[PDB]
Amino acid sequence: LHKEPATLIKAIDGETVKLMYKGQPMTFRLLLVDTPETKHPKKGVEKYGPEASAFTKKMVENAKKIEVEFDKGQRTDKYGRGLAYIYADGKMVNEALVRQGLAKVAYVYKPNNTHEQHLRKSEAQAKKEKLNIWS
Numbered sequence: 001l002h003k004e005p006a007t008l009i010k011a012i013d014g015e016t017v018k019l020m021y022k023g024q025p026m027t028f029r030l031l032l033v034d035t036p037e038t039k040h041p042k043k044g045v046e047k048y049g050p051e052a053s054a055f056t057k058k059m060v061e062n063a064k065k066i067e068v069e070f071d072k073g074q075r076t077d078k079y080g081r082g083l084a085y086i087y088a089d090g091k092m093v094n095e096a097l098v099r100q101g102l103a104k105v106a107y108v109y110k111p112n113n114t115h116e117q118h119l120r121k122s123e124a125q126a127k128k129e130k131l132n133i134w135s
């Protein structure tokens with residue numbers, strides 16, 4: 001893989017953060033995780049979505065270094081969003097959200113799945129801990 005510098009522009013929600021990467025503002029999708037929603041037109045807000053976006057916000061905002069890392073497969077999805085693992089001070093947000101019961105592992109697509117068993121290891125710990133979506 002290769003980690004890269006990127007600069008925070010805007011945390012949209014749990015799974016989506018806007019970042020200046022290569023000098024271009026880009027929408028980035030947190031690879032492998034699915035967070036609850038704040039806005040879904042046919043839904044309203046979903047349980048733990050407010051605090052899933054809160055979490056990521058705090059995490060990318062108080063960071064001194066944000067780094068993105070692309071996986072070994074296509075790097076942009078269909079809606080043109082970067083496909084990546086985001087590190088706030090070297091800690092993987094994508095992992096942090098699952099360790100805290102605020103994200104389930106999901107849409108795991110070969111070959112963009114290098115870190116599938118690390119996160120699938122962490123969801124298991126949070127489930128075993130009765131935490132938040134697993135409560």
Ligand SMILES: [Ca+2]
Nearest residue numbers: 034035036037
């Ligand atoms: Ca979602």
